[PDB]
């Protein structure tokens, strides 16, 4: 899912 | 450099998410934590040595959020931090399963906190609120605070001082900050094209991170320069865990495979593959013994071998 997403600014 | 070429399975703890896996000030307990709300404490020793029918926490401590890093304190051994996806900040006694501290000052969640090794009542935090907040355990109230431009991936104080610490954004750089004077960084390290994950220091100079643009590099903040990129793994999307010691680096990646790269070689010596995505490492500080958990909640012991 995307709970482990790293955020792109 | 290396005389490895492969990584050895010693014990498997059977399996959702597993966001941080982190041994304690002896090496001697391990803990892990993520998205299922609990932090579980392991004996090492009993995890190597005792068949995987009989394995069990020592320790489980139920929380109010999804978990995303744990830091144990450098002094006391029982103590460990983690931080949360409401932002929330926590340390916590293993003896007595309580919460000791509750920092509540982030307004989104905080995706790394780090205790210091040379002064271990301070803990670093970052968060996507874009702020670094530095706690002592003294005191209930942060007692610095740096406002960034963007998300703040991941924070690691140097293991030599605790005024200086790496913040990972996703700008896409490491900002290197001496506490002492937060009006500008020391200095801005880019090259990563996509934002940094993880930051983590080989010794007090060298400096790893990880990125996904899924590279490692390897950084020097005394002279404040680039040495070294890695490549080999996937890592586009996730945090998927970074290790260091003296000598070696250990990532996860997107294709279940945890990964480990000699500092001085581009390419990795060696790879395993379980069976997702890798979603923690940790080595037992400079040996060639290593922790691993992926998304499914399986934990590995692996021991690089000739």
Known sequence: EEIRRVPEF | FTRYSRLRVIAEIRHNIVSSIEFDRDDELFATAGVSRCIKVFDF?????????????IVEMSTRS???????????????????????????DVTTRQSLMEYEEHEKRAWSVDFSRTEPSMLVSGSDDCKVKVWCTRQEASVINIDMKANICCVKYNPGSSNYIAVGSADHHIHYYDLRNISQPLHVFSGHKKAVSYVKFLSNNELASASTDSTLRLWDVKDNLPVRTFRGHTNEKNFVGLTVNSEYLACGSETNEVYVYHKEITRPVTSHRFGYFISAVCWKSDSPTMLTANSQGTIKVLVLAA
């Open chain 2, 66 to 92: 999804k978990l995303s890093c744990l830091s144990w304190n450098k002094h006391e051994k029982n103590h460990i931090a983690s931080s949360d996806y409401e932002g929330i900040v926590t340390v916590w």
């Open chain 2, 45 to 57: 020793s009993s995890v190597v040595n005792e068949p995987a029918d009989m394995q069990c926490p």
